[model samples]
Target chain A: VIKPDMKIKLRMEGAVNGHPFAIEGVGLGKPFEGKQSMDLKVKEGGPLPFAYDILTTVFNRVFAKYPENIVDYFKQSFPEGYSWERSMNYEDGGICNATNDITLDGDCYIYEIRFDGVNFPANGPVMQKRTVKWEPSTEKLYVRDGVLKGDVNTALSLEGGGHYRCDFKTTYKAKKVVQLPDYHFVDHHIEIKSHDKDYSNVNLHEHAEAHSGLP
Target chain B: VIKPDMKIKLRMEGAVNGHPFAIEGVGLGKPFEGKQSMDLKVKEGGPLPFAYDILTTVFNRVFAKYPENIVDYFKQSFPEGYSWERSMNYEDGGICNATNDITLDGDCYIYEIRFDGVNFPANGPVMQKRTVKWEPSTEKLYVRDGVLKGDVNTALSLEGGGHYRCDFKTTYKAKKVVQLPDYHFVDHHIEIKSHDKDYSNVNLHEHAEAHSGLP
Candidate 1:
């Protein structure tokens, strides 16, 4: 067993000092802050916590101070849910669609806007309303500098062996103060996808979630 | 531009001073080490590097040391690619199967072993050879403490409107020294699944990649 308060001349083959591993106050007086030396008290053999783990511990702290990002603001404002209206212009008619069940993937900077309704075919004035459901496909929506802009085009398969080609575009912007039916306006459609743990326990980096790739 | 090294003291509502945000070596001697003080050099309005980015910069460094994990040991030994053999026992006959073209997902700790060959069906003594192939499904194989153990069962869809049910079990252990056909033995099938820049540049936490959720 190693003695307590004992210092050994550790000739390390690998370097763990002078890089990101250095502690700040290693000077004339701070003896405990070892220069290339290890911690005064290290736990018995197990996985050591690296720099990343420390950062994960304080991510929320730094994020809290720096004026929240898009996801944070969205999550706070719409704890229940977020719904917005977008203009959809077709060949014959236009719709100011209202959407909901929205989501954002903060890890990947992705957003999803979804809602659906019924509309007549763009060609003939048929009373049969086509059930228009617009959702994101395999394409991942990207957000840069908190702005989401893209074009989505698709043809809806209708009854009686016909189709209606439609296109939606978006120029949604993220801001602390948003005006209705204007900011985050999109002419396109999207889908989004997480985890659970203690809200107060800062040390817990990860919690096991029940998500299997098994088919 | 603002002054190079300016110290400002102002009262703050949100606490950024406590919890995981503390910097050590704060004393009467170390002047730069602040007490509820801000960084002397704050960059003009932009995204600030949180704890994660700093940890990422040193991840490779810390990882470079501290005895290599299973992935590193694996990546080094099988630079060209690792191939292995397993015994197959059926109702009538048994054969030692050889395998190759393997991969591992270090991000999530998943392993994939893939290979193909021709073999006789389990119940038939026919002259025709049945094409044999084994691969992972959507199921994610969980690895705990460097031990890979699981069971996978599948029925091979044959050409002659028939099938052969197969079950594989595994207890592959990871170590620097491995024995032939003995270590890393598997009786099951599994599937396992990024970026470019100056890898040495520790500050780079994220990179752009092409993955769209659009249809």
Candidate 2:
């Protein structure tokens, strides 16, 4: 039987909007467990184009549901068993709309989402379209000595104008006496390449605040 | 990913042919792994009616497949789906016929088999009908500290003229350095009771040999 006392660790590494990106985190209880403790960090290979923040914000929101336990989370996320759509508008005259789908297989679940719209700026509105697919690991868990340990592998693909793909492997350990660090975003490494530009040397962490204004 | 290297453990306990019976064993690979290790023991609480051994023989054959791993074993056991029937005749003027069905559910797989036949004896031919259902566990496995630990719970029902039900729980732990005992039949405990008889105080372990004639 699945119990509520189990601790969960999650990690995701992939690219978004043509930029290499990665995320790692941990949580307690299932995702639906109220007030669950969750910590997450996002990192990219290079400073993203100003227009890419919109895609980053959308990607983060989509991933926020992971802590809830993928199976139950998706059951509630897609009660009618089909695609779901949502739209958002920015005060700066920008627009973003997304369509998402989730499916179950014999071993693991699959999530797919597509984003389309434009980012408005003084120069002009830059049209953007992005799609992502993710699959979490399904390895079993084991208790050894006094600790519980497991490993999860997630596969992802981000494609639109540029194609970016990645495989994320995260190892987790849980114990009654184990102390976890305070929940905060930790930076991870990545490599960036684009079909249209060569801004590989740009500092990614320095632009952390650039994602704040997404609608 | 589910690999073929994993070891499997199986145990079952219940009454068969009006006698208390139990079995425990393990194997490498899925249930179909070649020449896997196995151990099984059968016992009866009291002297079985003269005609009961024939029924017990049939009962043991129905359960023999458990050691083979139920999932993959059943796929090949019943390739065309349910409603399977077979009949056999003995030179001694006996006849046997059986009908079987298999179904899959979210948490576990269900297998049900029914047998109806007449056993020939010098005195006369006796009619018998039997039905059985079995369910294997679905606990997820986890590797911790380089060791694998997991628990499995299987439930079974053997009903016909007599009602017999049993719950079997088996815990397994595997490590790179852990050496399993050589495969051999191990004895487990069981209690026998019947709605129509008073055979509660009979000694069960003495009748192990009665199960040898089963094919």
Candidate 3:
């Protein structure tokens, strides 16, 4: 019989309010979980197909159960929003607001948010509408070296933020033992804040000291 | 910055010599890997996007490297060959060895071997050929209760031996701590094999004959 005790590797990347970061981890399992159990004695395969769509499926599932966890994660890490209309400007005028329009890309499952704001000296709270887009190729990650992975770039802006974005890339490996119905899951989420309009810029504000200790 | 640790799960299914099998595992990682370190934290707002294609990419890479591992695994554990192949079957009227061909599906990798008289029964010489197939699938595993797993089934026919086939299944949990580039290196691979094959058709040709006893 094929020995189920084999090893694998993994890699990840994360981004926030447009800034990026990176992590890694491993996996284990037993036979008889569900469809994962099979008749052959062979090494389990690596990386899955349809990486982006699958990621979306899992992300949506997680969001359904932990929406607040994601929201909080974002709020605490990405304080600066990108200004959609300002064309690369860090001024507070183009920050995305609740009033901005948003759409979902059917192909890539990308949530696209847009907004129109007036210029202001100080960054202020702004509301913008939101939307998503699905251009698969634009967000597809190339696969190589027995590793299945993908890449994505995202940007966020509010009524009081500037123009900033983050780029993320990821890699995945599968465990030797099949778990049955529960397919293997691997991922790397990343966020990046553009240098021009990141917390650093906001930190330079004259009254920044007032919000310095805010969690 | 967002922490770099991530959690990933995987599911795999394929056929060996027509016997279906499945496997599932998980992996964790950062948004990206760097020159010297592996990330292991899932931070807030730090771009955290997951993809499924990563699984397929990894499988293809590993499979390509060890082209015969699947076949070898099956050969050591089971005695069988792909169904419907003339070369593997004893047809009375075919063009003998000329019309008999042992081939494998491009998408399905096959491994085969030929045995000679030196390793036979009755102290006589006998020549035999054995073949098996490895068919992989791209479907993602379904999950519940934090576990990712699947099921598999297979059938086999041994020339001058017997007919055997089995139905098997399994379950596994996804792990979140792993290494980069090779999750398999550090984590443990665990799996259980089921005992539910139908062997009613196996026929023994000769009685057990011992040097000091008569059959």
Candidate 4:
């Protein structure tokens, strides 16, 4: 069961706006107003930078792969490996290439989000923003290599903002342990379209700031 | 068990180098001298036309998403959503946009294949071709909706050629039922890189003709 507080590690690795980054933090998943809540920070990642469509690119590429690089984990979800596709320019910051090399250990909870324009800019919003969230709920702390861990899956919740699609999974070691999270996103009325246009040529420092800020 | 002569409904959807196409056929996955084989055709799809990097684009994008667009099933594998990234040119033909509305019922065994060049053209080969296959030996018929079903997962196998990463899945619906296939591909020595450059500015009419031709 989810408790009011648990010390855990939070990690985010994958491309952000087409650039690669891996950041992790140590924090507590406690209750706020009697609801489960998490508070973590950018423990380690880049020098790199960071979206909904931006997020989608990451989710689509990362979750579909296996470490050894034979077949993507989600590829088997479709019989012949055919599914949606999205493209981005260097400007769109579409995500690509994540580390299959890293493995998460122990039970993990996951989530997904499809959103456009959470890029809470310094001036204020300039685009029509839409958002979607999906997950089993980040109840249990995910551990990897005897360390509490995280990756691209739940990045959305932890993230303050971005035009992104974040897919969540719970795995024992880069392999899925929970079943429902895989097929649960459709209910949110998400559209499988490209965000390249929305994000291209746009810049934000305040993009990663918003209501979902991990408080 | 898979048979030497079993009439099945063959289908292929998703994108061809970033363009969307969905085609199906009535054919057979039969046994050859000592092996199982299939003979299917593009019965329906495209005014659209059709790669390795191209294949990877398809495999990566298609597999990472869920129909209702919830958390990507594979996302949960990571404590959060973070994975690799690959880009493609319009010419690279990185696949995108496959069907999720069409549901496949019954058992659907799956496969995974990553390859670089199989665009068997009318004249000859012009590129360095690499190939990889990850599946549970495609022994059982994955039937759906009282009819034999197939999707993008095995698209590479049936295509004869393409720059591809085909993710295979089996389930009562698109959810994977088979386990061994998911974590098995790394044995093939695959690389998680983009082929957009190699595939760009290349054309092939006989491209789809090759050694793996469905007989």
Winner by TM-score:
4
Where model 2 places Cα greater than 4 Å from the true spot, the runs are: A1-132, A135-139, A151-215, B1-215
Q: Highest lDDT, which number?
A: 2
Candidate 2 lDDT over residue span B1-215, tens digit each = 22334333333333432334333333233322221222223233333332332232222111221232122212332222222334434334455444334333432223344544454444432323232322111222222233322211222223432222221212222212332221111111122212123221222211110010001
> TM-score for model 2?
0.20
Give a tens-digit lDDT track for model 1, residues A73-159: 232432232333344434345332423223322221112323222343334322233422222211112233344332333333344
Instruction: Tell me which of candidates 1 and 4 scores higher on lDDT.
Output: 4
Reference-based lDDT, residue B192, model 1: 11
List the DockQ of the predictions in order: 0.08, 0.01, 0.01, 0.02
| Predicted structure 4, TM vs. truth | 0.25
> What lDDT does candidate 3 reach at residue A173?
23
Deviation in Å, model 1, residue B22 alpha carbon: 62
Residue B1 CA displacement from its true place in model 4, Å: 24
Top-scoring candidate (DockQ): 1
Stretches of candidate 1 exceeding 4 Å from the true structure:
A1-83, A91-126, A130-146, A170-215, B1-215
Order of the predicted models by TM-score, top scorer first: 4, 2, 1, 3
Q: TM-score, each model?
A: 0.20, 0.20, 0.15, 0.25
C-alpha RMSD between model 2 and the true structure: 24.3
Task: Score candidate 3 by TM-score against the native.
Answer: 0.15
